[PDB]
Write a protein that binds this ligand. Structure first.
Ligand code: XYS
Ligand code: XYP
Ligand code: XYP
Ligand code: FE2
Length: 286
C-alpha cells in the first residue's frame, strides 16, 4: 500500500523537485509553494501573487526560477518574487506549466492555454544564451525531461494523450521528433508530468488514471503504481538514495462524490522503488 506523507488536499499539486534534501512543489490554483522535510515531517508554505507552476533551483542558492502566469520570475523566501522575463503576450491567456533542468543547467519549461482550449502553448529552453522557443502549438504542455545520457528528450501533449521523444544534441537542439507513447484506452486518462530515472526509464503520472506508469526506453510499460487519488500530476525521485518516489496529486476536476471516496486526493504520496532517479540539476544563470 502507498503512503500519503502529507494530507495537503491541494487543488493542483504540481512540479515536485528534490532540493536541499527536502521536497519542494507547488499548488498552482491555490498559488502556493510548499516544502516538505521527510526526516521530521515538517511543512512550510509560501504565498504566491499568481498561479505558480514550476520551481527550478539556481546555482549558488540565489533562489528559484518559477513560473507565474505573469511571466518567469525569481523567487527567494527573503525577497519574494521578481520578474525575470515575460515570454508570451498576456492576451493569449497563457500560463507556464511544467519544467525540468538538464545536466548542462538549462531550464526547459512549457506554456499552456490557461483555459485549456487553445493550442497556444510552447516549449522553451532558458540558458545563458537566453530563451529559445523549441516547440509550439500545444494546448497543454507537460513533463519535459532528459535521459541520463543526455541524448534523448521527452515532452508531452496532454490533451492529445501523446508523449514525444527527440534527439538532444550537446549544443542543446532538438531533432528527429517522433511519438514515444500514445495512450488509447481511457477516455479520461491523460498523461501529465513525467521524469526519467537513472536507468533511462520514463515515469509518467496519469491524470484520471489513479497512479503512474514506468516505460522502458523502447516505449513499453513495465510497472504501474496505483494511488488512492484519481488525478496524479507528477513523480519526483527523492530520499537519501533517490529511491523514494514521491507523487503530487490534484483535487481539481473531481466531483464531490469522488473526493468523498478519495479524501486523500491532492496529497503528497511516497513509494519505495528499486531503481534510483536522477539527481536534481540547478539552473545556470551566470
Ligand atoms: O536553495 C535555496 C533554498 O535554501 C531557499 O533559500 O530558497 C532559495 C533557494 O535558492
Ligand atoms: O491544468 C493542469 C496542468 O497544470 C497539469 O500540468 O496537467 C493537467 C492540467 O489539467
Ligand atoms: O482520509 C481521511 C482524511 O482525508 C480526513 O481529512 O480525515 C479523515 C480521514 O479518514
Ligand atoms: Fe503537469
Amino acid at each position: 500500500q502507498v503512503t500519503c506523507v502529507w494530507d495537503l488536499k491541494a487543488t493542483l499539486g504540481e512540479g515536485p523537485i528534490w532540493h536541499g534534501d527536502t521536497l519542494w512543489f507547488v499548488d498552482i490554483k491555490q498559488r502556493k509553494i510548499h516544502n516538505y522535510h521527510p526526516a521530521t515531517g515538517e511543512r512550510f508554505s509560501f504565498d504566491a501573487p499568481d498561479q505558480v507552476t514550476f520551481l527550478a533551483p539556481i546555482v549558488g542558492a540565489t533562489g528559484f526560477v518559477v513560473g507565474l502566469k505573469t511571466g518567469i520570475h525569481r523567487f527567494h523566501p527573503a525577497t519574494g518574487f521578481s520578474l525575470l522575463l515575460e515570454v508570451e503576450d498576456a492576451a493569449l491567456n497563457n500560463r507556464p506549466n511544467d519544467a525540468t533542468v538538464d545536466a548542462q543547467g538549462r531550464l526547459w519549461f512549457g506554456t499552456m492555454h490557461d483555459g485549456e482550449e487553445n493550442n497556444s502553448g510552447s516549449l522553451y529552453r532558458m540558458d545563458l544564451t537566453g530563451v529559445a522557443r523549441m516547440d509550439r502549438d500545444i494546448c497543454i504542455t507537460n513533463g519535459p525531461c532528459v535521459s541520463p545520457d543526455g541524448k534523448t528528450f521527452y515532452h508531452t501533449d496532454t490533451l492529445e494523450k501523446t508523449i514525444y521523444a527527440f534527439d538532444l544534441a550537446e549544443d542543446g537542439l532538438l531533432s528527429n521528433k517522433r511519438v514515444f507513447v500514445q495512450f488509447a484506452l481511457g477516455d479520461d486518462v491523460y498523461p501529465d508530468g513525467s521524469v526519467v530515472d537513472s536507468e533511462g526509464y520514463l515515469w509518467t503520472a496519469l491524470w484520471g488514471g489513479f497512479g503512474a506508469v514506468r516505460f522502458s526506453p523502447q516505449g513499453d510499460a513495465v510497472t504501474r503504481i496505483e494511488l488512492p487519488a484519481p488525478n496524479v500530476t507528477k513523480p519526483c525521485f527523492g530520499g537519501p538514495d533517490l529511491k523514494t518516489l514521491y507523487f503530487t496529486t490534484a483535487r481539481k476536476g473531481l466531483s464531490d462524490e469522488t473526493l468523498a471516496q478519495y479524501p486523500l486526493a491532492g496529497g503528497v504520496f511516497a513509494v519505495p522503488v528499486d531503481v534510483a532517479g536522477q539527481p536534481q540539476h540547478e539552473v545556470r544563470l551566470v
